[PDB]
């Protein structure tokens, strides 16, 4: 149906906008702390601590399968990146501090992304 197609075109356009959001958020992580999944070879206990791991590569795979239906879904995954890191790592660590900075800087980007998603529809 044409209605199915139009819905598909909206998903595609949201996918475009979320790719640009993703790039901008990932630029706020120049150390690449959040670029890849935590390795279970190098942190064997990780899944005892963190039940839903997340990273920018895993978000990028979901994005390219058009797997985010709305901004809320995408933000949930972003927040997992930050929130997981801030539980596993102590306050005095470079990891925790990097999460804080990504959160604070990413807030700005997400604030305008929400306006654009609502505005364009």
């Amino acid at each position: 149906s044409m209605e199915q197609v139009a819905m598909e075109l909206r998903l595609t356009e949201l996918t475009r906008l979320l790719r640009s959001v993703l790039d901008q958020l990932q630029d706020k992580d120049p150390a690449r702390i959040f670029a890849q999944p935590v390795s279970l070879k190098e942190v064997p206990d990780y899944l005892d601590h963190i039940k839903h791991p997340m990273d920018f590569a895993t978000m990028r795979k979901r994005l390219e399968a058009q797997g985010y239906k709305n901004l809320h879904e995408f933000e949930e995954d972003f927040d997992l990146i930050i929130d997981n890191c801030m539980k596993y790592n102590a306050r005095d660590t470079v990891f925790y501090r990097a999460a804080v900075r990504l959160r604070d800087q990413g807030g700005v980007v997400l604030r305008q992304a929400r306006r654009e998603v609502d505005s364009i529809g």
Side-chain angles (χ1 to χ4, degrees), residues 18 23-24 27-28 30 34 50 53 62 64 67 70-71 87 92:
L18 298 182
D23 291 344
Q24 282 179 76
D27 290 340
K28 312 306 181 167
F34 305 107
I50 301 302
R62 186 164 166 189
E64 294 312 324
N70 58 50
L71 183 56
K87 293 173 188 76
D92 68 328

Side-chain angles (χ1 to χ4, degrees), residues 12-15 17-40 42-60 62-68 70:
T12 293
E13 285 313 293
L14 170 69
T15 305
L17 177 164
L18 298 182
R19 186 172 308 121
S20 166
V21 172
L22 186 56
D23 291 344
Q24 282 179 76
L25 295 173
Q26 188 158 18
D27 290 340
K28 312 306 181 167
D29 175 31
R32 300 194 72 84
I33 293 169
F34 305 107
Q36 296 293 330
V38 171
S39 178
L40 304 168
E42 301 170 351
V43 192
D45 75 355
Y46 192 62
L47 301 179
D48 295 341
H49 293 263
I50 301 302
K51 299 299 167 188
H52 298 99
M54 196 43 56
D55 68 273
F56 284 129
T58 304
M59 294 192 58
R60 194 175 296 281
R62 186 164 166 189
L63 186 59
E64 294 312 324
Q66 299 189 346
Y68 296 112
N70 58 50

